């Protein structure tokens, strides 16, 4: 138990090191409790006004690439801090990151979301949900269920301590395709899961079944990533020559 608390604290410490924009920082921005106000993008005119941050919907989605590549870098830093991670076979670390990063990006995306919109570029902007919903199909339908997931995930009131371990658990998923040595992965995960269980019991003592809800949220995130991947397949079927950051080419390769 005590060692499980020591591991929880170590993970929160690294998450703090690795991720500049914490959930706590983000919620402070979203509730005006902070530091300069985000610029609001609610229509085409405010969008072109805020550009210092192809057809519009492709422009908006392709501009997420800069952030996603930074996030991968952050997530890699955080993964390396998880005890046991760097001692795993190197190709298995790559595998874990390859199939993990988007789950973690959507996890952190929820932290930047409320029912009305999403923070962008380190909180310097706020894109509204209605604006995103007005985009041409299939783009306009895509984010809606992301907001839905975020609103329910945020209702659980996890903090950064909680999230750090939740994230560690996800990265140490033994079932990613083509992992060469699964057992040491699972042994790490099993211990993380115990740290998470205790973390949730001490930190959310009135919250019935939180541990199990969180397991289900990991399944929801796989589903969300499956959908994210199919949005890009659908769009590649007509946007033949669409630039893609080389880091992300590695991640999307084979999917």
């Amino acid at each position: 138990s005590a060692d499980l608390r020591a591991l929880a604290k170590h993970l929160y410490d690294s998450y703090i090191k690795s991720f500049p924009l914490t959930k706590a920082k983000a919620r402070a921005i979203l509730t005006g409790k902070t530091d300069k106000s985000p610029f609001v993008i609610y229509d085409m005119n405010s969008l072109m006004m805020g550009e210092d941050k192809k057809e519009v919907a492709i422009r908006i989605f392709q501009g997420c690439q800069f952030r996603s590549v930074e996030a991968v870098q952050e997530i890699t830093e955080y993964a390396k801090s998880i005890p046991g991670f760097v001692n795993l076979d190197l190709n298995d670390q790559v595998t874990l990151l390859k199939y993990g990063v988007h789950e973690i990006i959507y996890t952190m995306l929820a932290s930047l979301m409320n029912k009305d919109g999403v923070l962008i570029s380190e909180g310097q902007g706020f894109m509204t949900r209605e604006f995103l919903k007005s985009l041409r199909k299939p783009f306009g339908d895509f984010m809606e269920p992301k907001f839905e997931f975020a609103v329910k995930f945020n209702a659980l009131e996890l903090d950064d301590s909680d999230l750090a371990i939740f994230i560690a658990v996800i990265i140490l998923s033994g079932d990613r395709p083509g992992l060469l040595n699964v057992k040491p992965i699972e042994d790490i995960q099993d211990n993380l899961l115990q740290a998470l269980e205790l973390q949730l019991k001490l930190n959310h003592p009135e919250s019935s079944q939180l541990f199990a809800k969180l397991l289900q949220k990991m399944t929801d995130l796989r589903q969300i990533v499956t959908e994210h991947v199919q949005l890009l397949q659908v769009i590649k079927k007509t946007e033949t020559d669409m630039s893609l950051h080389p880091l992300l080419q590695e991640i999307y390769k084979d999917l």
Binding site: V72, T76, K80, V86, L90, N91, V94, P246, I251
Partner: peptide, 10 residues
């Protein structure tokens, strides 16, 4: 080669 693998070794 692999960009992830470089970020892992850094």
């Amino acid at each position: 080669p692999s960009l992830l693998k470089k970020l892992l070794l850094a």
